[PDB]
Amino acid sequence: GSLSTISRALTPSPVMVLENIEPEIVYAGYDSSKPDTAENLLSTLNRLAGKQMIQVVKWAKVLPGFKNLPLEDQITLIQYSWMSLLSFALSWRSYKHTNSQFLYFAPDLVFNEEKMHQSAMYELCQGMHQISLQFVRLQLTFEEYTIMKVLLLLSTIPKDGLKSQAAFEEMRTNYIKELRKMVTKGQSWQRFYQLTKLLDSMHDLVSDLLEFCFYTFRESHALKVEFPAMLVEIISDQLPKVESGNVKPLYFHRK
Numbered sequence: 001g002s003l004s005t006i007s008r009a010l011t012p013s014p015v016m017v018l019e020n021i022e023p024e025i026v027y028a029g030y031d032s033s034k035p036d037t038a039e040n041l042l043s044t045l046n047r048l049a050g051k052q053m054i055q056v057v058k059w060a061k062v063l064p065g066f067k068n069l070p071l072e073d074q075i076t077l078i079q080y081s082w083m084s085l086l087s088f089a090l091s092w093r094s095y096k097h098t099n100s101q102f103l104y105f106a107p108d109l110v111f112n113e114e115k116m117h118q119s120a121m122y123e124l125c126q127g128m129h130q131i132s133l134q135f136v137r138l139q140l141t142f143e144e145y146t147i148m149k150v151l152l153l154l155s156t157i158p159k160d161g162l163k164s165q166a167a168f169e170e171m172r173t174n175y176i177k178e179l180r181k182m183v184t185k186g187q188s189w190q191r192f193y194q195l196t197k198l199l200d201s202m203h204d205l206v207s208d209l210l211e212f213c214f215y216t217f218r219e220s221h222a223l224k225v226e227f228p229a230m231l232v233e234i235i236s237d238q239l240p241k242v243e244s245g246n247v248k249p250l251y252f253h254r255k
C-alpha cells in the first residue's frame with residue numbers, strides 16, 4: 001500500500017527522490033541454449049531495450065519537474081534520449097557490478113570480448129566500454145549518476161525547439177543546479193566540468209549507436225534482427241528526424 005503520509009513528512013530532496021524512483025532490475029531473457037549469433041544477440045538486446053524503455057517511461061513520470069512538460073514534449077524527450085539513457089545505464093551497471101570489466105546488460109546477459117564480437121557490435125561495444133572506464137577513472141557516485149541520467153533525458157531536442165521550451169529549460173537548469181550542488185557537497189568546478197564533459201561525450205557515442213541501430217533496423221529482415229513494438233515506434237519516427245538534421249544535441253562545452 002501507499003505510505004505517502006510518512007514519505008511526504010520525510011520531505012525527500014530531489015536527489016533522494018531520484019534514488020527512490022530508480023528502475024528495478026530488468027532481465028534480458030537471454031537463452032544460453034541458443035546460438036550466440038548476431039541475430040540472436042541483437043534480438044535479445046532489443047528485447048531488453050524495449051523492456052527497459054517501459055521502465056524509463058514509468059521513471060520519467062515520477063521524475064520531479066517532468067509533469068510540468070506537455071505530453072508532446074514528454075514523448076519527444078523520452079524518444080530522443082532513449083539510446084543515451086540506456087547506454088548510460090549500461091555503463092553504470094558495468095561499473096557497479098563488474099568494475100567496468102564487462103558490459104553488464106542484465107544479470108543474465110553480461111558481455112565479454114567474445115560476446116562483443118558475436119553481437120556484430122564489437123567496435124561500438126568498445127566505445128561503450130570507454131564510458132564505463134571513465135566511470136572508474138572518475139569514481140562516479142550513484143548520486144552523480146542519477147542526476148546525470150536526468151540531464152541525458154534532457155539532452156536532445158528538436159532543432160526548432162520543444163512545444164514548451166521555457167518549461168524544458170527550467171527543468172534542465174534545475175537539474176544542472178542539482179549537479180552543481182552535488183559536486184560541491186577544492187575541485188568543485190573541475191568535477192562539474194569532468195561530469196558535464198562526459199555528458200557531452202555521450203552524444204558522440206550515441207549518434208554512432210543510433211546510426212548503427214537505424215542501419216540494422218532498415219536491414220532487419222535480411223539480418224534477422226527483431227525489434228519490439230516500442231522500439232519500432234521510436235526508431236521509425238526518429239529516423240527521418242535525425243537524418244534530416246532536425247535533432248539537436250545540447251552540449252555544456254560545445255556550441
Ligand SMILES: O=C1COc2ccc(/C(Cc3ccccc3)=N/n3cnnc3S)cc2N1
Pocket residue numbers: 038039042120121122123124125216223225
Ligand atoms: O561495431 C561495429 C562497427 O561498425 C560495423 C559496421 C558494419 C557492421 C555489420 C555487421 C552487422 C551484422 C548484423 C547486424 C548489424 C550489423 N555490417 N554488416 C552488414 N551486413 N552484414 C554485416 S556483418 C557491424 C559493425 N559493428
Ligand SMILES: O=C1COc2ccc(C3=Nn4cnnc4S[C@H]3c3ccccc3)cc2N1
Pocket residue numbers: 042043045046048049052083086087090105121124125128209210212213214216217225
Ligand atoms: O539492433 C540493434 C543494433 O543497434 C543497436 C545499438 C544499441 C543498442 C543498445 N541496446 N541496449 C540494450 N540494453 N541497453 C542497451 S543500450 C545499446 C547498446 C549500447 C552499447 C553497446 C550495445 C548496445 C541496441 C541496438 N540494436
Ligand SMILES: [K+]
Pocket residue numbers: 250251252253254255
Ligand atoms: K552549448
